[PDB]
């Protein structure tokens, strides 16, 4: 069988971009998202970056530059325990809060927290903030889903709804919000308000506790020890949205000084490298 990886293979081999080899960036969609028109002359084109891990949600606002895009404001999902949400830091309701936390924190540093307060109450209807004359214009950014398949009800659009309710003017439509019946092509806003306030999570805690309590303890183990029940879901997120709108500013942790103690071994120098093969040759000639 002929060898596929020979000298002629690697000599002709052209590697992809590093962010492409890692599978993190889609350069076909990035070009159409971060590149600004040439008749704008360094007008920053902002975008909301929403990323999901197995335990955390990252929401950032950036604008592209040649030496790397700068992050204007970043709100993480592990900051919700400061506002009350100590459980389920990766569900749809926690995505609406980190988007709201990113919207209110951005408007704070830009001096736009008095104007464009968004929807204080959660109604689920399509809301797009309006720019009032005389006052500074609303912040207009765009959504960056990345490699996440944008289906109806994805949590990427949960932070999108949290940002447009905070005051951000992001263009979108209610076709991909949870509660859009594609059969009738109508958006039922009442279903969306349930996912925003975690009401769909409460119905799961009740469907298990009233059927078999054994599985309820495995699925919601940390929900029991933290003292949150199925009846304390809607109110928990409501008072969390209130705390986010009050103090959205995030202070950095005190810089802890470290002696920079390395835990990895260093590369072998040229002396240690040649001396090792010199010992293997000498040890090979003694055995014969």
């Amino acid at each position: 069988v002929k060898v596929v990886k020979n000298k002629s293979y690697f000599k002709r081999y052209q590697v992809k971009f590093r962010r492409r080899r890692e599978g993190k960036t889609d350069y076909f969609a990035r070009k159409r998202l971060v590149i600004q028109d040439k008749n704008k002359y360094n007008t920053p084109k902002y975008r909301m970056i929403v990323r999901f891990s197995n335990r955390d949600i990252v929401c950032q606002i950036a604008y592209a530059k040649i030496e790397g895009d700068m992050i204007v404001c970043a709100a993480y999902s592990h900051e919700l325990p400061k506002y009350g949400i100590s459980v389920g830091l990766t569900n749809y309701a926690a995505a609406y809060c980190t988007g709201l936390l990113l919207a209110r924190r951005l408007l704070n540093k830009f001096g736009l927290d008095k104007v464009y307060d968004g929807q204080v109450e959660i109604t689920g209807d399509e809301f797009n903030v309006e720019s009032i004359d005389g006052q500074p214009g609303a912040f207009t950014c765009y959504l960056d889903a990345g490699l996440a398949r944008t289906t109806t009800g994805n949590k990427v659009f949960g932070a999108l709804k949290g940002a447009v309710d905070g005051g951000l003017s992001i263009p979108h439509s209610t076709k991909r919000f949870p509660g859009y019946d594609v059969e009738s092509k109508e958006f039922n806003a009442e279903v969306h308000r349930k996912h925003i306030l975690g009401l769909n999570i409460a119905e799961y805690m009740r469907l298990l506790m009233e059927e078999d309590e054994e599985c309820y303890k495995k699925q919601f183990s940390r929900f029991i020890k933290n003292g949150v029940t199925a009846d304390s879901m809607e109110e928990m997120y409501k008072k969390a949205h209130a705390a986010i709108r009050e103090n959205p500013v995030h202070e950095k942790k005190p810089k802890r000084e470290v002696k920079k103690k390395r835990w990895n071994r260093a590369k072998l120098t040229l002396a240690q490298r040649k001396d090792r093969v010199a010992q293997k040759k000498a040890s090979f000639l003694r055995a014969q």
Partner: protein
Amino acid sequence: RRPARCYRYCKNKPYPKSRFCRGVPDPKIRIFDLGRKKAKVDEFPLCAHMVSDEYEQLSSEALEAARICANKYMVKTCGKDGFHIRVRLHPFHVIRINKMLGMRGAFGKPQGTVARVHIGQVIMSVRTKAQNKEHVIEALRRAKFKFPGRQKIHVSKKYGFTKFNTCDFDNMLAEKRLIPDGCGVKYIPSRGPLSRWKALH
């Protein structure tokens, strides 16, 4: 056929047999290695060439004739298993022939293949034992009369058909830098994996 005086000088760009040039007849020479070709490097230390001194092109029929002329003299003076002839010129340039005759559409059909040679390029190479030097020079001398132009019969300083000198070939064998494989040697540098170094020892 047309005499070789008409296709002696390299006037045209190289016109090889390819997808665009179809219908080329087979070259006159088809065998390039003769003698005991499956001999090791330490059997035929001597090497002698037929170096060219003119930038011209040698026909395929001349390479065939001079090969047999040098071969018939080596088999009678050194035996059929005491030499190795390697013709180092392959006929690749296709010379053209105009229609048998105005010149409306004068581009001609292929006539044959002709090997283009440079000043200093080896035409033939013969390796044999160290005591057959006077026979190879005479065998290669008789083959010059089958070629147009001027050729030189130079006894090379390399070790047979290899590219290493004779004064260094014996030292590179003891240092395991060269291993014989058929009619040539393998240059084994000191920059590979250590597994193949232990195989040599």
